[PDB]
Amino acid sequence: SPFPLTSMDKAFITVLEMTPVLGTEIINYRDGMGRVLAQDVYAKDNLPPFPASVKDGYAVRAADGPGDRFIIGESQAGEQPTQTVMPGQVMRVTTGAPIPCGADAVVQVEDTELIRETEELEVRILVQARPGQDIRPIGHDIKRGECVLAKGTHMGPSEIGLLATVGVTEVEVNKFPVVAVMSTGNELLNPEDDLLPGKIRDSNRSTLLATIQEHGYPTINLGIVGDNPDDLLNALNEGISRADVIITSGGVSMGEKDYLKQVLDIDLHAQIHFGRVFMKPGLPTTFATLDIDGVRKIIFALPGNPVSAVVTCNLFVVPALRKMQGILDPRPTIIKARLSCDVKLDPRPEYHRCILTWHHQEPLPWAQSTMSMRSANGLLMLPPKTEQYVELHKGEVVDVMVIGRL
Amino acid sequence: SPFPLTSMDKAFITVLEMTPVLGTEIINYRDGMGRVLAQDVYAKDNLPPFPASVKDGYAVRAADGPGDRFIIGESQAGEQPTQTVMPGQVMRVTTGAPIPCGADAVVQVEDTELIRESDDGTEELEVRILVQARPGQDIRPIGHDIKRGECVLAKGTHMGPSEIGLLATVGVTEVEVNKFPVVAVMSTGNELLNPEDDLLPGKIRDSNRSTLLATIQEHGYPTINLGIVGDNPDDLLNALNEGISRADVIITSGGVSMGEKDYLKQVLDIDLHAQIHFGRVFMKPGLPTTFATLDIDGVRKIIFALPGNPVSAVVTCNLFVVPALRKMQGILDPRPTIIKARLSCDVKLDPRPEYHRCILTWHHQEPLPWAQSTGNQMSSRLMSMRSANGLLMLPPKTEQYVELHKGEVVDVMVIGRL
Amino acid sequence: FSIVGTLY
Amino acid sequence: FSIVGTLYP
């Protein structure tokens, strides 16, 4: 008080450690995007359940080799075949169609010729076939009883389809964090309003909400709240009861008007882990936890500066939210890139919104600090200035944190 | 008939060229995520509208220099200051607070010392400035960030969270953006059952429909589930007619491909009078891939007939469908992002250009990411603690390169947000 | 730009 | 892993 300057490294690991993992719930598989499985998923069927042809052609006997063959019938999709392939005979099959008994290989139609015939009667096999050629045996893809999805899996479209394949339409996943977002400051107006003297429009709330919504987390708009202990307490109490995570932006960090940290400490009795982070931007960033009824809510107090808000939200909030929804490694993806512009280094670890662009035949992407037609998908991670390294130049390999779709 | 083997390169450019760009509509700024601006956005205000302090400190006169000064008051946020800074006087300011007239510089509290306070100790009265300030130091002048009447967002801009916040800043709550493509997905095949159903002899569960929808929804486009459709001209025509009336894109999976059993293309050409641009693509997987356009009432619908094979469905969707969808929603460069990575596993090359679902992994001090190929269906699911975010792009085999080895730099297409 | 795949 | 930007000459 004033809170000690927490190093950027320590501030990050503090957020993750103090951030809890949410409970689990049962959802339909169609709602599994971005969800983390809290259970193993076993297959109760074989895939394929039957021997299936890979190519469109004819089920043959490898022992018969090339030659003239009789077409005894056709194997339809969705129907179990009733005929058996005898020596000197073949059966027309389509891709995915069941393989009849007697056949051990499939010869594609490109390796055949219609000899004699609405129904075909005779065909010539032009090639020698290996046993098992172009055939998917029972359980070649998925064996029965096999674990197809382990707990901890961060599901995407393919995992949804795998659930649909095995028939597990209901799965146990971690809950998604409900995030309440509010903005503080007596200078804030609603974006719909025209400007009044000394006032600006509230942009942080819109950006933060859009950021959280992009990761698919349910959000709650607490709107603009006056910079005073009474209104702050009401907004915080509402956010605490309705959300797992409460995010605020703006408000006097430093002075004695720190109504936010006054309410958090005196009225809410929450534990403030850090109130300042040695970083640029986002120095007056505050992280607090609050234990109610054996349940831990987390609270972020982001700087009023628009650039600071989006930067601190991607650095602290998003990794925390990912941990809550059950992601094993909630840490952001960091890649190596080249600087599109020269840049002076700051004693503090600095972060710039940037745009990652891969140029053809070039191994490393280029990061351009805030083209204008594209939304920033990266967060340039500048090192703190030390010794000879007072400045970084165009072309040097730097770290870039992925914050959006590549 | 049978359709010529279209090269992978030609198949891709055909899709983009035959894919239309949707019309526009007015939306609220809060719904602008992933939307492309069809208009220039002008600021009607300056940002900041007033000179604003960058640091917590005191609004001072540079000409007064360091020394003992009188604290005439404090500039509050949201209020235009009423007092004027005279020589020898300063005003306490916080970050973001308006700068009072008379002041031309701001000295932060770290470069100051509180000399004397009131007898109550509740008010600061006199302060010592420890440094010399430059005119304009730690002050954001009017319109430092945004000037009035200035173009802050040009048409064609693909908006993210920041672009939304920028709209809120300038006060433009209503914008003209391209519509999102409505995508309808169906599955064809007499062997298909709903995932909720138990298996019957010769039957499998429909997984493509769930995956395809999930892939489109990941990109934030509205989807329509047309369910399972029987492989026959009557049921296909009904499903297609419904999809056309309800959607801009119609995706189907399955079907008996080519031959006289090719109901799908028979309905498209004969009944629907649609134009099939290609029916076969020299690729792996997804050889029997069909793309078609249909012009109704001056409106062009696009139709994708993807292979029934589960692996082929997701691969072809990321290669053809998604770039087409991005074009429809107004993105100027709808082409996918392709990056360089190193192979984590050896792999035999195919005469056809081959594509494998893979997992991209960036390491600490390693410049290139490692791409571990997922064999196809189940291989990854032993190490699938992460979803496949990449698409390994293998070159067609030649007498020179028959096989690729561990460590070689290869092309990988990012197919999902990390 | 290539949709097939290059080498190094 | 580091949340602070790293360097390499």
CSV table of C-alpha atoms in Angstrom, one decimal, chain A residues 201-363:
chain,number,residue,atom,x,y,z
A,201,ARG,CA,-17.2,6.9,-24.3
A,202,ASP,CA,-16.7,3.5,-22.5
A,203,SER,CA,-14.8,1.3,-25.0
A,204,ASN,CA,-13.2,-1.2,-22.6
A,205,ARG,CA,-16.4,-2.9,-21.7
A,206,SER,CA,-17.2,-3.6,-25.3
A,207,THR,CA,-13.7,-4.9,-26.1
A,208,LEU,CA,-13.4,-7.1,-23.0
A,209,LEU,CA,-16.8,-8.6,-23.6
A,210,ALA,CA,-16.0,-9.3,-27.3
A,211,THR,CA,-12.7,-10.8,-26.1
A,212,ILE,CA,-14.3,-13.2,-23.7
A,213,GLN,CA,-17.2,-14.0,-26.1
A,214,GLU,CA,-14.6,-15.0,-28.8
A,215,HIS,CA,-13.4,-17.8,-26.6
A,216,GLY,CA,-17.1,-18.9,-26.2
A,217,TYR,CA,-17.5,-18.1,-22.5
A,218,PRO,CA,-20.9,-16.7,-21.3
A,219,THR,CA,-20.7,-13.1,-20.4
A,220,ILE,CA,-22.6,-10.6,-18.2
A,221,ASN,CA,-22.8,-6.9,-18.9
A,222,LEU,CA,-22.8,-5.0,-15.6
A,223,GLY,CA,-22.5,-1.7,-17.5
A,224,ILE,CA,-21.0,1.6,-16.3
A,225,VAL,CA,-20.5,1.9,-12.6
A,226,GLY,CA,-19.7,5.1,-10.7
A,227,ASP,CA,-16.3,5.5,-9.1
A,228,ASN,CA,-17.6,5.3,-5.5
A,229,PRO,CA,-17.7,2.6,-2.8
A,230,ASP,CA,-21.5,2.3,-2.7
A,231,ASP,CA,-22.0,1.7,-6.5
A,232,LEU,CA,-18.9,-0.4,-6.8
A,233,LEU,CA,-20.1,-2.6,-3.9
A,234,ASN,CA,-23.5,-3.1,-5.5
A,235,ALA,CA,-22.0,-4.0,-8.9
A,236,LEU,CA,-19.4,-6.3,-7.3
A,237,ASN,CA,-22.0,-8.1,-5.2
A,238,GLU,CA,-24.2,-8.6,-8.3
A,239,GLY,CA,-21.3,-9.9,-10.3
A,240,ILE,CA,-20.2,-12.2,-7.5
A,241,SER,CA,-23.6,-13.8,-7.2
A,242,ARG,CA,-24.2,-14.1,-10.9
A,243,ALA,CA,-20.7,-14.9,-12.3
A,244,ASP,CA,-17.6,-16.9,-11.5
A,245,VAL,CA,-15.3,-14.1,-12.8
A,246,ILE,CA,-15.8,-10.4,-12.4
A,247,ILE,CA,-13.8,-8.0,-14.5
A,248,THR,CA,-13.6,-4.3,-14.0
A,249,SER,CA,-11.8,-1.6,-15.9
A,250,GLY,CA,-10.9,2.0,-15.0
A,251,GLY,CA,-11.0,3.8,-11.7
A,252,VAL,CA,-8.2,5.6,-9.8
A,253,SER,CA,-5.6,3.0,-9.0
A,254,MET,CA,-3.4,5.1,-6.9
A,255,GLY,CA,-4.1,7.8,-4.4
A,256,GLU,CA,-6.7,7.1,-1.6
A,257,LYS,CA,-9.6,7.1,-4.0
A,258,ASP,CA,-8.9,3.5,-4.6
A,259,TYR,CA,-12.5,2.7,-3.9
A,260,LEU,CA,-12.1,-0.5,-5.8
A,261,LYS,CA,-9.4,-1.9,-3.6
A,262,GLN,CA,-11.1,-0.3,-0.5
A,263,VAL,CA,-14.3,-2.2,-1.3
A,264,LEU,CA,-12.5,-5.4,-2.0
A,265,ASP,CA,-10.6,-5.2,1.3
A,266,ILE,CA,-13.0,-3.6,3.7
A,267,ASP,CA,-16.5,-4.7,2.5
A,268,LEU,CA,-15.8,-7.9,0.6
A,269,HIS,CA,-12.8,-9.0,2.6
A,270,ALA,CA,-11.3,-10.5,-0.6
A,271,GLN,CA,-7.6,-11.3,-0.8
A,272,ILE,CA,-5.6,-9.0,-3.2
A,273,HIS,CA,-2.7,-11.0,-4.6
A,274,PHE,CA,-1.2,-8.1,-6.5
A,275,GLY,CA,-2.2,-4.5,-7.2
A,276,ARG,CA,0.7,-3.5,-9.5
A,277,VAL,CA,2.6,-5.4,-12.2
A,278,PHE,CA,6.0,-4.3,-13.5
A,279,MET,CA,4.8,-4.2,-17.1
A,280,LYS,CA,3.9,-1.9,-20.0
A,281,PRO,CA,1.2,-1.3,-20.4
A,282,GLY,CA,-1.0,-2.4,-17.5
A,283,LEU,CA,1.0,-1.2,-14.4
A,284,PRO,CA,-2.1,-0.7,-12.2
A,285,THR,CA,-3.5,-4.2,-12.7
A,286,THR,CA,-5.1,-5.9,-9.7
A,287,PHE,CA,-6.0,-9.5,-9.1
A,288,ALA,CA,-8.0,-10.8,-6.2
A,289,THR,CA,-9.8,-13.9,-5.1
A,290,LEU,CA,-12.8,-14.3,-2.9
A,291,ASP,CA,-14.0,-17.4,-1.1
A,292,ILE,CA,-17.8,-17.6,-0.7
A,293,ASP,CA,-19.5,-20.8,0.5
A,294,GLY,CA,-16.4,-22.9,-0.3
A,295,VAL,CA,-16.4,-21.5,-3.8
A,296,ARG,CA,-13.6,-19.3,-5.1
A,297,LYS,CA,-14.5,-16.3,-7.3
A,298,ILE,CA,-11.8,-14.4,-9.1
A,299,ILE,CA,-11.6,-10.7,-9.6
A,300,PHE,CA,-9.6,-8.7,-12.1
A,301,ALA,CA,-9.2,-4.9,-11.9
A,302,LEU,CA,-7.8,-3.8,-15.3
A,303,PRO,CA,-6.4,-0.4,-16.1
A,304,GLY,CA,-8.7,2.2,-17.7
A,305,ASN,CA,-6.3,2.7,-20.6
A,306,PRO,CA,-7.9,0.9,-23.7
A,307,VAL,CA,-4.6,-0.6,-24.9
A,308,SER,CA,-3.8,-1.8,-21.4
A,309,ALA,CA,-7.2,-3.4,-20.9
A,310,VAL,CA,-7.0,-5.6,-24.0
A,311,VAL,CA,-3.3,-6.5,-23.3
A,312,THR,CA,-3.9,-7.4,-19.6
A,313,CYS,CA,-7.1,-9.3,-20.5
A,314,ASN,CA,-5.1,-11.6,-22.9
A,315,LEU,CA,-2.2,-12.0,-20.5
A,316,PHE,CA,-4.1,-12.8,-17.3
A,317,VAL,CA,-7.8,-13.2,-17.8
A,318,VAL,CA,-7.9,-15.6,-20.8
A,319,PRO,CA,-5.3,-18.0,-19.3
A,320,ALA,CA,-7.3,-18.0,-16.1
A,321,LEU,CA,-10.5,-18.7,-17.9
A,322,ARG,CA,-8.9,-21.6,-19.8
A,323,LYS,CA,-7.8,-23.2,-16.6
A,324,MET,CA,-11.3,-22.9,-15.1
A,325,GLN,CA,-12.9,-24.7,-18.1
A,326,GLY,CA,-10.5,-27.6,-17.5
A,327,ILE,CA,-7.7,-26.9,-20.0
A,328,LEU,CA,-4.6,-28.7,-18.7
A,329,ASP,CA,-2.1,-26.2,-20.2
A,330,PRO,CA,-3.9,-22.8,-20.0
A,331,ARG,CA,-0.7,-21.0,-21.1
A,332,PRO,CA,-0.9,-19.0,-24.3
A,333,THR,CA,0.9,-20.2,-27.5
A,334,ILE,CA,4.1,-18.3,-28.0
A,335,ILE,CA,5.8,-18.3,-31.4
A,336,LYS,CA,9.0,-16.8,-32.9
A,337,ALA,CA,8.6,-14.0,-35.4
A,338,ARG,CA,10.5,-11.2,-37.2
A,339,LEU,CA,10.0,-7.5,-36.3
A,340,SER,CA,8.4,-5.4,-39.1
A,341,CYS,CA,9.7,-2.2,-37.5
A,342,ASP,CA,12.5,-1.0,-35.3
A,343,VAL,CA,11.5,-0.4,-31.6
A,344,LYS,CA,13.0,1.2,-28.5
A,345,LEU,CA,13.1,-1.0,-25.5
A,346,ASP,CA,11.5,-0.2,-22.1
A,347,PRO,CA,12.9,-1.1,-18.7
A,348,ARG,CA,9.5,-2.8,-18.2
A,349,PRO,CA,8.6,-5.9,-20.2
A,350,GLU,CA,6.5,-4.4,-23.0
A,351,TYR,CA,3.6,-5.7,-25.0
A,352,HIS,CA,2.2,-4.5,-28.4
A,353,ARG,CA,-0.8,-5.6,-30.4
A,354,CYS,CA,0.5,-7.0,-33.6
A,355,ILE,CA,-0.4,-8.8,-36.8
A,356,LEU,CA,1.2,-12.1,-37.7
A,357,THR,CA,1.7,-12.5,-41.5
A,358,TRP,CA,3.4,-15.5,-43.1
A,359,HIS,CA,5.2,-14.7,-46.3
A,360,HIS,CA,5.6,-17.5,-48.9
A,361,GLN,CA,8.7,-19.7,-48.7
A,362,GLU,CA,9.7,-17.8,-45.6
A,363,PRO,CA,10.0,-19.9,-42.4
